Design a protein around this ligand. Structure first.
Ligand code: APR
Length: 185
């Protein structure tokens, strides 16, 4: 970072663009970045820590503000905080499922779609997703990536009115980067 590599690009249903990019997600200038968290908006995951790093106290205080107003975050739920201290306008926080928990793969796809729904609700044009679930939550990195990419593709099918024009799938750790390139794109 500020490392940024476009690894692939794909046209979605109505011409929206899905880019797989290599970068520190905290450095991405999209309208939203996605923070995988838990029911109590814990900031301690791998992405949470990189955001914390980049955004400092202003970030931490935005999450706290959200935590107060929102209360506990339901499973697969998504909520949004101002991206104070960050290049991103907003941070979308999602209750990431744990690998091995019931229906965790379905939940991962739901979590992704709820984030997209929330970005649409805020009329956002861009939204960057890390590989939710495959850090502290233990998903195999290939499986997480597959489920996220599939959910993204699925959200845009038949959707006419989405504000979202660009979705980034952000890879940072070398195992994930390698898995993606090794296969296709
Ligand atoms: N700077 C970064 N940019 C992009 N991706 C990153 C970065 N750092 C790590 N990653 C990748 O982000 C992916 C998701 O990791 P986590 O942030 O740890 O998210 P997750 O696995 O969903 O777990 C969240 C966990 O911590 C939360 O506080 C909550 O308690 C939950 O248990 C992983 O593949 C990890 O390699």
């Amino acid at each position: 970072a500020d490392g940024f590599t476009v690894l692939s690009t794909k046209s979605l249903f109505l011409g929206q663009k899905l880019q797989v990019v290599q970068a520190d997600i905290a450095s991405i200038d999209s309208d939203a970045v996605v923070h995988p968290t838990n029911t109590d908006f814990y900031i301690g995951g791998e992405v949470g820590n990189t955001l914390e790093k980049k955004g400092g106290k202003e970030f931490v205080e935005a999450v706290l503000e959200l935590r107060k107003k929102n209360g506990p975050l339901e499973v697969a739920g998504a909520a949004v905080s101002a991206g104070h201290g960050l290049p991103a306008k907003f941070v979308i926080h999602c209750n990431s499922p744990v690998w091995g928990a019931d229906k965790c793969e379905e939940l991962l796809e739901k979590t992704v779609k709820n984030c997209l729904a929330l970005a649409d609700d805020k009329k956002l044009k861009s939204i960057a997703f890390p590989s939710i679930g495959s850090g502290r939550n233990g998903f195999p990195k290939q499986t997480a990536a597959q489920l996220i990419l599939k959910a993204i593709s699925s959200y845009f099918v038949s959707t006419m009115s989405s504000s979202i024009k660009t979705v980034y799938f952000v890879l940072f750790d070398s195992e994930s980067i390698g898995i993606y390139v090794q296969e296709m794109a």
